[PDB]
Design a protein around this ligand. Sequence first.
Ligand SMILES: CC1=CC(=O)CC(C)(C)[C@@]1(O)/C=C/C(C)=C\C(=O)O
Lengths: 183, 183
Amino acid sequence: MPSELTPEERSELKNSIAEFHTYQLDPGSCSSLHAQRIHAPPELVWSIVRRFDKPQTYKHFIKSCSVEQNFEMRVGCTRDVIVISGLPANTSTERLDILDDERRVTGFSIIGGEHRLTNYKSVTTVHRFEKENRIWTVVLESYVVDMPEGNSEDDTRMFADTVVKLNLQKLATVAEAMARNSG
Amino acid sequence: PSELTPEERSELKNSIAEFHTYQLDPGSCSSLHAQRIHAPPELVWSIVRRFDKPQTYKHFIKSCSVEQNFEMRVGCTRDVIVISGLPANTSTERLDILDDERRVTGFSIIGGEHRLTNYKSVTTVHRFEKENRIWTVVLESYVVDMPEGNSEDDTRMFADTVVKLNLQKLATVAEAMARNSGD
Ligand SMILES: CC1=CC(=O)CC(C)(C)[C@@]1(O)/C=C/C(C)=C\C(=O)O
């Protein structure tokens, strides 16, 4: 029942963390890794996580997300996310960096607008677990960001940690709701 | 919430009328949220009535201080410090209502570095019983002044996000306290 990963989960994710969630830090950057257990099939979770054009399905504070007219989801495509965690609303342009449907890995970079200066980059991976009868999922999300050059010069990285956590909670809630409509 | 059942709805009609209904003033906007909680209403009330400890059930609070003499009576104030990353650093709030017999509390934001002018919130706590089970519904509503008519949706969107999140945290915290009190 503790939300923290078990030793078995942790062992099973080591290779994934090494491959996908380990960053080469530039001086004056930092990185963080979050995990969320989800009681729903990993295919269902991944179908949510992979939709680069619809982050608002599991993320908080999103006013809108717009993509190109005829949107084809591929590495290098961009989206504009308007967030209302700032008043007035801020626009960030994000690039899709990784999409592997076989291995269930996606990731993005903030390349313009608000927080461009941060060099924010994030990776999310979805993992299958099975024991006894039961199948469940663990999502890992990590990011790397520049540290602010100040004593409180918009040092917003605690807010980044906090919002990654809440977003993973929203993903769990949404995905678990959907799986109970399956049968 | 996840959503009020038809039964809950009808039982709450009077409370909704008395505490959670607003006159359709232009340049103001209002919203009502509900949250089901699987814990005793006395326990939920004991958390929500603590004007000097909003951080027990609210997200985004770094700290809160009250006067050096604090008696919690209507008209008292608290100085809430917010984590960085949000439209505000601080908020000064005044207790409007505290009714221990009816389980109703409310507050108004009166100062601070932020964007929520004339924000006023009311929270009411409700007992439900069906068969051999007790649960709580919490209702929270607010009214606030909009910057403009087009930027009204953003203010409502922001405040709705925080209120929904804080009610979710209230549910998780009350549910966790109820377990640990038993065993
Ligand atoms: C989290 C936060 C960010 C802001 O920018 C405004 C303010 C500082 C007031 C606030 O505490 C907002 C609190 C809200 C909406 C509701 C509450 O507290 O019941």
